[PDB]
Every structure is written in structure tokens, then in C-alpha cells.
Design a protein around this motif. Structure first.
Motif, PDB file in Angstrom:
ATOM      1  N   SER A  22       0.835  -1.188   0.000  1.00 22.65           N
ATOM      2  CA  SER A  22       0.000   0.000   0.000  1.00 22.65           C
ATOM      3  C   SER A  22       0.873   1.242   0.000  1.00 22.65           C
ATOM      4  CB  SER A  22      -0.912   0.045   1.230  1.00 22.65           C
ATOM      5  OG  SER A  22      -0.127  -0.067   2.418  1.00 22.65           O
ATOM      6  N   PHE A  37      -1.769   6.581  -2.267  1.00 19.56           N
ATOM      7  CA  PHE A  37      -2.961   6.688  -3.098  1.00 19.56           C
ATOM      8  C   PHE A  37      -3.819   5.432  -3.113  1.00 19.56           C
ATOM      9  CE2 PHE A  37      -3.153  10.574  -5.740  1.00 19.56           C
ATOM     10  CZ  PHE A  37      -2.007  11.201  -5.276  1.00 19.56           C
ATOM     11  N   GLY A  38      -3.286   4.276  -2.751  1.00 22.17           N
ATOM     12  CA  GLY A  38      -4.106   3.086  -2.768  1.00 22.17           C
ATOM     13  C   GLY A  38      -3.368   1.845  -2.331  1.00 22.17           C
ATOM     14  N   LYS A  43      -4.179  -1.773  -8.653  1.00 24.73           N
ATOM     15  CA  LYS A  43      -4.169  -0.718  -7.652  1.00 24.73           C
ATOM     16  C   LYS A  43      -5.590  -0.218  -7.482  1.00 24.73           C
ATOM     17  CE  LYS A  43      -0.969   2.252  -6.606  1.00 24.73           C
ATOM     18  NZ  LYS A  43       0.153   3.109  -7.012  1.00 24.73           N
ATOM     19  N   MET A  95      -2.056  -3.005 -14.261  1.00 27.03           N
ATOM     20  CA  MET A  95      -0.806  -2.960 -15.009  1.00 27.03           C
ATOM     21  C   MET A  95      -0.149  -4.322 -14.930  1.00 27.03           C
ATOM     22  SD  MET A  95       1.717  -0.761 -12.495  1.00 27.03           S
ATOM     23  CE  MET A  95       3.174  -0.818 -13.552  1.00 27.03           C
ATOM     24  N   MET A 104       4.952  -7.335 -11.687  1.00 23.94           N
ATOM     25  CA  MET A 104       6.394  -7.517 -11.607  1.00 23.94           C
ATOM     26  C   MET A 104       6.708  -8.440 -10.455  1.00 23.94           C
ATOM     27  SD  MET A 104       7.102  -5.542 -14.045  1.00 23.94           S
ATOM     28  CE  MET A 104       6.790  -3.969 -14.841  1.00 23.94           C
ATOM     29  N   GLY A 128       9.113  -7.282  -7.699  1.00 25.32           N
ATOM     30  CA  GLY A 128       8.773  -6.174  -6.841  1.00 25.32           C
ATOM     31  C   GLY A 128       9.540  -4.906  -7.183  1.00 25.32           C
ATOM     32  N   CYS A 129       9.508  -3.948  -6.254  1.00 29.14           N
ATOM     33  CA  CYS A 129      10.190  -2.687  -6.492  1.00 29.14           C
ATOM     34  C   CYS A 129      11.681  -2.792  -6.185  1.00 29.14           C
ATOM     35  CB  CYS A 129       9.597  -1.556  -5.654  1.00 29.14           C
ATOM     36  SG  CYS A 129       9.850  -1.780  -3.882  1.00 29.14           S
ATOM     37  N   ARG A 134      10.975   3.087  -4.419  1.00 30.02           N
ATOM     38  CA  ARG A 134       9.723   2.340  -4.310  1.00 30.02           C
ATOM     39  C   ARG A 134       8.872   2.463  -5.561  1.00 30.02           C
ATOM     40  NH1 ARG A 134       9.247   6.804  -0.709  1.00 30.02           N
ATOM     41  NH2 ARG A 134       7.968   8.400  -1.741  1.00 30.02           N
ATOM     42  N   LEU A 149      10.243  -0.337 -10.512  1.00 33.78           N
ATOM     43  CA  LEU A 149       9.941  -1.758 -10.461  1.00 33.78           C
ATOM     44  C   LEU A 149      11.035  -2.553 -11.159  1.00 33.78           C
ATOM     45  CD1 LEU A 149       6.110  -1.597 -11.211  1.00 33.78           C
ATOM     46  CD2 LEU A 149       7.251  -1.959  -9.031  1.00 33.78           C
TER      47      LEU A 149
HETATM   48  N1  LIG Z   1       3.108  -3.620 -11.025  1.00 30.22           N
HETATM   49  C1  LIG Z   1       3.519  -4.020  -9.828  1.00 30.22           C
HETATM   50  N2  LIG Z   1       3.975  -5.284  -9.682  1.00 30.22           N
HETATM   51  C2  LIG Z   1       4.388  -5.679  -8.471  1.00 30.22           C
HETATM   52  N3  LIG Z   1       4.425  -5.000  -7.331  1.00 30.22           N
HETATM   53  C3  LIG Z   1       3.969  -3.754  -7.512  1.00 30.22           C
HETATM   54  C4  LIG Z   1       3.511  -3.202  -8.685  1.00 30.22           C
HETATM   55  N4  LIG Z   1       3.118  -1.889  -8.471  1.00 30.22           N
HETATM   56  C5  LIG Z   1       3.342  -1.681  -7.197  1.00 30.22           C
HETATM   57  N5  LIG Z   1       3.857  -2.773  -6.569  1.00 30.22           N
HETATM   58  C6  LIG Z   1       4.213  -2.890  -5.178  1.00 30.22           C
HETATM   59  O1  LIG Z   1       3.081  -2.549  -4.420  1.00 30.22           O
HETATM   60  C7  LIG Z   1       3.493  -1.934  -3.175  1.00 30.22           C
HETATM   61  C8  LIG Z   1       2.740  -0.643  -2.981  1.00 30.22           C
HETATM   62  O2  LIG Z   1       2.921   0.212  -4.129  1.00 30.22           O
HETATM   63  P1  LIG Z   1       2.153   1.611  -4.100  1.00 30.22           P
HETATM   64  O3  LIG Z   1       0.783   1.393  -3.571  1.00 30.22           O
HETATM   65  O4  LIG Z   1       2.333   2.310  -5.397  1.00 30.22           O
HETATM   66  O5  LIG Z   1       2.996   2.398  -3.003  1.00 30.22           O
HETATM   67  P2  LIG Z   1       4.491   2.932  -2.976  1.00 30.22           P
HETATM   68  O6  LIG Z   1       4.780   3.346  -4.384  1.00 30.22           O
HETATM   69  O7  LIG Z   1       5.303   1.822  -2.386  1.00 30.22           O
HETATM   70  N6  LIG Z   1       4.302   4.194  -1.984  1.00 30.22           N
HETATM   71  P3  LIG Z   1       3.753   5.648  -2.446  1.00 30.22           P
HETATM   72  O8  LIG Z   1       4.815   6.275  -3.268  1.00 30.22           O
HETATM   73  O9  LIG Z   1       3.466   6.519  -1.269  1.00 30.22           O
HETATM   74  O10 LIG Z   1       2.490   5.547  -3.232  1.00 30.22           O
HETATM   75  C9  LIG Z   1       5.021  -1.826  -3.247  1.00 30.22           C
HETATM   76  O11 LIG Z   1       5.625  -2.922  -2.576  1.00 30.22           O
HETATM   77  C10 LIG Z   1       5.291  -1.904  -4.749  1.00 30.22           C
HETATM   78  O12 LIG Z   1       6.573  -2.403  -5.043  1.00 30.22           O
END
Ligand SMILES: Nc1ncnc2c1ncn2[C@@H]1O[C@H](COP(=O)(O)OP(=O)(O)NP(=O)(O)O)[C@@H](O)[C@H]1O
Ligand SMILES: CN1CCC(c2ccc(-c3ccc4ncn([C@@H](C(=O)Nc5nccs5)c5ccccc5)c(=O)c4c3F)cc2)CC1
Ligand SMILES: [Mg+2]
Length: 292
Positions: A21, A24-25, A46, A91, A94, A97-98, A142, A145
Motif C-alpha cells: 500500500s 494513493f491506494g 491498484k 498494469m 512484476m 517487486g520494487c 519504491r 519496479l
Molecule cells: N506492477 C507491480 N507489480 C508488483 N508490485 C507492484 C507493482 N506496483 C506496485 N507494486 C508494489 O506494491 C506496493 C505498494 O505500491 P504503491 O501502492 O504504489 O505504493 P508505494 O509506491 O510503495 N508508496 P507511495 O509512493 O506513497 O504511493 C510496493 O511494494 C510496490 O513495489
């Protein structure tokens, strides 16, 4: 154009596991079930935290069509959207992960060739976003990816609070430009070179604005030579026009990546797995078939 964003029905995808999380979500590993098929295709979903009215949904959609239209090997693309009471965005998933989690979990096995190439690749993606008139506004490790360990991609950029990644003029005046993105890029590079340290750890966010005007910056990462740290410092200059351009950062890190041992000082760097051609072809055939 509009064919690049698939509007999904609730009935054709399913959330199966929480990934994480952010502001934004919440991100889920999910499954796409093509209509008329028996296969289940993994996706990342998301879900926006705040339910929206169809009036804000026009704004969300307007932007979704833009995020679905990017096409560069180092930038992620939005694939689909489902406009439920809370909007869901789809989307590619991955599995690695990040990049932040990647460098934290591999703190003792990441050689300099990988680190410098990641820096090149992030700069390439940001340069493409600038060419497209897109400002990221939340660049951080973060929001990078890992597609394969050899190939990273920027995510979660946008159009028009992470205080510790923001340029000074963003903290004070809500000014966001490509030059403020270069500031955030500098912090991102610092996260990678410290293998995922928290920037300004223990300094309250309320007081970051003050220490930046007084001239403190993030410290030199232990593995960094002065040549690399000088680049990070130039990214955090107060005069936004003195910060490097992404075009210049690509050239600079490409030079350093041709002799990574001159610029990063890593113990065991001689024994660290370097990206082999055999390993590169295998990874690309299973997970990463795009042009690059
Ligand atoms: N396409 C994806 N595939 C795999 N993991 C993902 C993907 N997009 C996001 N994540 C993972 O989902 C988690 C939350 O991502 P997200 O909700 O965008 O928050 P964030 O980018 O970590 N924080 P913030 O910058 O405040 O929004 C993190 O561990 C990301 O690495
Ligand atoms: C003023 N009020 C208050 C809140 C307002 C608001 C406005 C716009 C949006 C909006 C629109 C489109 C979006 N399009 C994509 N994304 C990224 C993304 O989906 N990430 C993912 N991770 C995993 C699965 S999906 C992404 C993915 C790939 C490349 C770039 C960006 C977005 O976050 C995104 C987006 F937030 C949300 C809320 C609306 C009304
Ligand atoms: Mg994110």
C-alpha cells in the motif's frame, strides 16, 4: 490511442493477494480471466483508497489515457482500468517487486555493474518522461519496479507527502518541474547506493525544509567514490537550473558503468554475479520479451 487503455468489467478480473500500500491506494496481485477462456493471467491491481464520483472519474480517466500511452523500455505503462465505486487500475505484475525491496533483500550480493546500470536505466526513463512533457512527482526507489534483475522500469508517474524525496522548492512553494524531479532522482540514487537506507533517518519531516536551507545533504554513501557523490550533490543544488539534466545523467552513469570498479567500492565486487549473456537471454525469453 484510446485503444491503449482497456476498460475492464468487474467480472473479468479478481484480486487474489495484497502486495502493499501507499499514499494513493493498495496494490494487489490479481488475475485476469479473458472472456470465453479458461486461463488466468496474473496482473497487478491498484485500488484507489477514496471512492470517487463519476465527476472525478472523468479526471482519473483523462489521466489514465495518458499513462496507457507511454512506450519506452524503462517506463511502465498503464494497461486497464475498472471504474467501480473505488477505481481500480491494472498494469503488468512484476514478480520481483520494487527496486527498494530488491536492494534491501540483496544488500550483500549486488555488484557495482548492477547499481550503475540501474542508475542509467532510471535516468533513461526519466528522460523519456521529460520528452513526453510528464513530471513524475513521486520518484523514489519504491516507484522503480524490477522487471528482471537486469531491467528496471519507472512506475507511478503522473501529470499535475514524500517530504524526504522532494526538492526544496517543492517543500516550500508547491513548485514541481523536471528539475525538482532531478532532485528526487538524486535521492533515489542514494537509496540504491546505501542498499535501501531511509533518507534523513530520524530527522522529523517538519524539520527537513530547515536543514536543506542550512546546506546539509544526505551523506556520502560508504560505497561511493567522490565522482559519484558529486553527481548526487549536484542534483540537490538549491538553484534548480544548476541541477544536471537527465540527458547529462545518462551520459555520466554510462561512462561510469563501462568501468564500474573505478566508481563504486564494494567488498566482494570481483566475485559478484555480473549480467551474463546466457543469463540475459534466459530471463528475457521467460519474463521480458520487449525490445529494449
Ligand atoms: N506492477 C507491480 N507489480 C508488483 N508490485 C507492484 C507493482 N506496483 C506496485 N507494486 C508494489 O506494491 C506496493 C505498494 O505500491 P504503491 O501502492 O504504489 O505504493 P508505494 O509506491 O510503495 N508508496 P507511495 O509512493 O506513497 O504511493 C510496493 O511494494 C510496490 O513495489
Ligand atoms: C481531485 N480528486 C482527488 C483524487 C484525484 C485522482 C486523480 C487521478 C488519479 C489517477 C489517474 C490515472 C492513473 N494512471 C495510472 N496510475 C499508476 C498505477 O496505476 N499504478 C499501479 N500499480 C499497480 C497496479 S496499477 C501508473 C502506472 C503505470 C505508469 C504510470 C502510472 C495512477 O496511479 C493513476 C491515478 F492515480 C487518481 C486520483 C481525483 C479527484
Ligand atoms: Mg508506487
Amino acid at each position: 490511442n484510446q485503444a491503449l487503455l482497456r476498460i475492464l468489467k468487474e467480472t473479468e478480473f479478481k484480486k487474489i493477494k495484497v502486495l502493499g500500500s501507499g499514499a494513493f491506494g493498495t496494490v494487489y496481485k490479481g488475475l485476469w480471466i479473458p472472456e470465453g477462456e479458461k486461463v488466468k493471467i496474473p496482473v497487478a491491481i491498484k485500488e484507489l483508497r477514496e471512492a470517487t464520483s463519476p465527476k472525478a472519474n472523468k479526471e482519473i480517466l483523462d489521466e489514465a489515457y495518458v499513462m496507457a500511452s507511454v512506450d519506452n523500455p524503462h517506463v511502465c505503462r498503464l494497461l486497464g482500468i475498472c471504474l467501480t465505486s473505488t477505481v481500480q487500475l491494472i498494469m503488468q505484475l512484476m514478480p520481483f517487486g520494487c527496486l527498494l525491496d530488491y536492494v534491501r533483500e540483496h544488500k550483500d550480493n549486488i555488484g557495482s555493474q548492477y547499481l550503475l546500470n540501474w542508475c542509467v536505466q532510471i535516468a533513461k526513463g526519466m528522460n523519456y518522461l521529460e520528452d513526453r512533457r510528464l513530471v513524475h512527482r513521486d520518484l523514489a526507489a519504491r516507484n522503480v519496479l524490477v522487471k528482471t534483475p537486469q531491467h528496471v522500469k519507472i512506475t507511478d508517474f503522473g501529470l499535475a507527502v514524500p517530504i524526504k524525496w522532494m526538492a526544496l522548492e517543492s517543500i516550500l512553494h508547491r513548485i514541481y518541474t523536471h528539475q525538482s524531479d532531478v532532485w528526487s532522482y538524486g535521492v533515489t540514487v542514494w537509496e540504491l547506493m546505501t542498499f535501501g537506507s531511509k533518507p534523513y533517518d530520524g530527522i522529523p519531516a517538519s524539520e527537513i525544509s530547515s536543514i536543506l536551507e542550512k546546506g546539509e545533504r544526505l551523506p556520502q554513501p560508504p560505497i561511493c567514490t567522490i565522482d559519484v557523490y558529486m553527481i548526487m550533490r549536484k542534483c540537490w543544488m538549491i538553484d534548480a537550473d544548476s541541477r544536471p539534466k537527465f540527458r547529462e545523467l545518462i551520459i555520466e552513469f554510462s561512462k561510469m558503468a563501462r568501468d564500474p570498479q573505478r566508481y563504486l567500492v564494494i567488498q566482494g565486487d570481483e566475485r559478484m554475479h555480473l549480467p551474463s549473456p546466457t543469463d540475459s537471454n534466459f530471463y528475457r525469453a521467460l519474463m521480458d520479451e520487449e525490445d529494449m
